[PDB]
Every structure is written in structure tokens, then in C-alpha cells.
Amino acid sequence: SYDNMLKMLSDLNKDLEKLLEEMEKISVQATWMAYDMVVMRTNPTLAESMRRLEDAFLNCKEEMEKNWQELLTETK
Amino acid sequence: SYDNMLKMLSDLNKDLEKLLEEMEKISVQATWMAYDMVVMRTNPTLAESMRRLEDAFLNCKEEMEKNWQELLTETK
């Protein structure tokens, strides 16, 4: 059984890890999208590009919150 | 204009922050859902609950990747 538990744990760890790594990628990329925009200020449409990016961030945050509520329902 | 740039930057920072904080919450909660399950081993249906949770993790990861492609499209 010890090997069976080790296999189950391995699979849960792999799947949690894939989720965490996905979120890590989003985090780093979103941070550089923001910081790059504020440093590339010569952009002529700075106002609109900042608005588009920040509303995209809010949209993604809200979708992720709905994904998370879905997970909570699937696992309750 | 300096004050206006400060205001735009403030709003982008707020929205990026809300995204990052959402992902932080998911990260911490998903980690404790996994670790609590592996320590509450007396659970009679451990196999099924581990399967449900790991598949929920994979589903959430895949949804987040689709959300992220949506953001990349909105901001291209």
C-alpha cells in the first residue's frame, strides 16, 4: 500500500504543481506587462494602453474567482 | 501632467495588485486543500477525494490558461 499512497501523492503533487506554476507564469508576465508600459512612456496612446491592460487584469481576476468558486463546488 | 501620470499609475497598480492577490489566495488555499487531505488519511474515500481535487486543480489550471490567452488577445 505504501507504494500506492506514494503514487496517489505523486499525482496530486504534480497537479497542484501545474496549477501553481501556471499562476507563477501569469504573475511574472502580468507584472512585466505593467512595468514595461509605464517605462515605455513615449507610447502615444499610453492612456488607452494602460486602460486596456488594467481592465484585462480585472477581467482575468474575476474569471479566476469564478474558476475558484467552480473548484470549491466540485470538491465540497 | 505629473499628477495625472501618478493617477494612471495608481490605477494600474491597484488592478495588477488585485490580480496578484487573487492568485495568492488561490495558491495558499489550494496548497492547504492538498496537504490537509494527505494528512487526514483516515478518510475512507481518500482515493476518490484525491482524484476529485487533482482533476479540479487541472481544470482550474486549464481555465486560467484560457483566461490568459484571452488577456493576450485583448492587449495585443
Residue numbers in the entry:
A (entry chain B), B (entry chain A): 10 to 85
Published text:
The crystal structure of mouse SYCE3 has been reported, revealing a compact four-helical bundle formed of two helix-loop-helix chains interacting in an anti-parallel configuration. The resultant structure is more complete and covers amino acids 10–85, which includes the additional loops and short N-terminal extensions. The SAXS scattering curve was poorly fitted by the crystal structure, with a χ2 value of 22.2. We reasoned that this may be due to the 9-amino acid N termini that are present at either end of the molecule but are absent from the crystal structure owing to lack of electron density. We modeled N termini onto the structure using MODELLER, with them adopting largely flexible conformations. This full-length model fitted closely to experimental SAXS data with a χ2 value of 1.46, indicating that scattering data are well-explained by the crystal structure with additional unstructured N termini. Thus, we conclude that solution-state SYCE3 adopts the compact dimeric fold observed in its crystal structure. We identified Tyr-11, Trp-41, and Trp-44 as surface aromatic residues that exhibit high crystallographic B-factors, indicating that their side chains are flexible and do not contribute to the dimer fold. The Tyr-11/Leu-15 and Trp-41/Tyr-44 interfaces from both chains are located on the same side of the SYCE3 dimer, indicating the presence of a single self-assembly surface.
The synaptonemal complex (SC)2 is a unique biological structure, formed through the supramolecular assembly of largely α-helical coiled-coil protein components, that binds together homologous chromosome pairs during the first meiotic division (1–3). In mammals, the SC is formed of at least eight protein components: SYCP1–3, SYCE1–3, TEX12, and SIX6OS1. SYCE3 is a small protein of 88 amino acids that is essential for SC assembly, meiotic division, and fertility. Thus, the role of SYCE3 as a synapsis initiation factor may be achieved by mediating SC central element interactions.
